[PDB]
Amino acid sequence: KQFHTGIEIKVWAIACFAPQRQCTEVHLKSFTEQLRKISRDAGMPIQGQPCFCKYAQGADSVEPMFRHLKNTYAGLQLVVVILPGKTPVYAEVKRVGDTVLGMATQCVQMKNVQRTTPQTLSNLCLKINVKLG
């Protein structure tokens, strides 16, 4: 689809369902910085500092976390969710985000947070653009 202008993502969260020992804090910070720069250059700036960034484990942690996020951060525009491979977490994120709380979520694979490429970051921005468009 066509790119939408005028999006600024100022309030957003990271929920990392990948294990910290696999997807460390510096991996998260590096990924976030790369995402900040390309979204900016593309004209849909995602601000560099998320309002929240935490690790969690298992699909059962999703609903309590997203409820917490909704109850805590006014103006929340997006939750970026990092998945460790193929996992029931994805289905739960979408159930809770799309059909329970009306919260925009974008999932990303752990391997693409550990090592980014402009192309994978581009895929992400485009998915995000469509969602908040």
Residues 65, 132: Cα–Cα separation, whole Å: 21
Cited resolution, angstroms: 2.0
Contact present, 38 and 118 (Cβ < 8 Å): yes
The residue ranges of every structural domain in the chain are 8-133
Question: Other CB atoms closer than 10 Å to residue 127's CB: what's the count?
Answer: 13
Q: Which tokens hold the place of 76?
A: 């929340």
Q: How is domain 8-133 classified at the CATH fold level?
A: Rossmann fold (3.40.50)
Q: Would you put residue 75 in left (φ > 0), alpha (ψ -120 to 50) or beta?
A: left
What are the structure tokens assigned to 118, written together? Answer: 């402009």
The approach used to solve this structure was: X-ray
Cβ(69)–Cβ(79) under 8 Å? yes
Instruction: Give every CB contact of residue 41 below 8 A, 6+ residues apart in sequence.
Output: none
